[PDB]
């Protein structure tokens, strides 16, 4: 992931409420 969106679906669509990525790491906070 480069940008917030690049983990948004990969995490949030996958069961997280949030999955923001920056640089190359994303904070995916589950549901």
């Amino acid at each position: 992931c480069k940008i917030s969106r690049q983990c948004l679906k990969p995490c949030k669509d996958a069961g997280m409420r949030f999955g923001k990525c920056m640089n190359g790491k994303c904070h995916c906070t589950p549901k």
Side-chain angles (χ1 to χ4, degrees):
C1 70
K2 321 298 176 63
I3 309 294
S4 329
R5 60 187 302 132
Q6 303 299 89
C7 272
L8 194 164
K9 337 206 176 68
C11 289
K12 178 185 178 180
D13 174 84
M16 314 291 181
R17 282 179 296 246
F18 295 99
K20 55 182 61 177
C21 178
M22 188 185 303
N23 303 94
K25 63 180 184 302
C26 42
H27 292 115
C28 315
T29 50
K31 295 191 175 76

